[PDB]
Amino acid sequence: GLSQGVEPDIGQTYFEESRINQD
Cβ partners under 8 Å of residue 15, min gap 6 = 8, 9
Tell me how the structure was determined: NMR
Contacts of 22 (CB under 8 A, 6+ apart): 1, 9, 11, 12
Contact criterion met (CB below 8 Å) for 1 and 13: yes
SS3 assignment for 1-23:
CCCCCCCCCEECCECCCCCCCCC
The answer to whether the CB of 21 falls within 8 A of the CB of 12 is yes
Please report, in angstroms and rounded to a whole number, the separation of the first and last CA atoms in the chain. Answer: 9
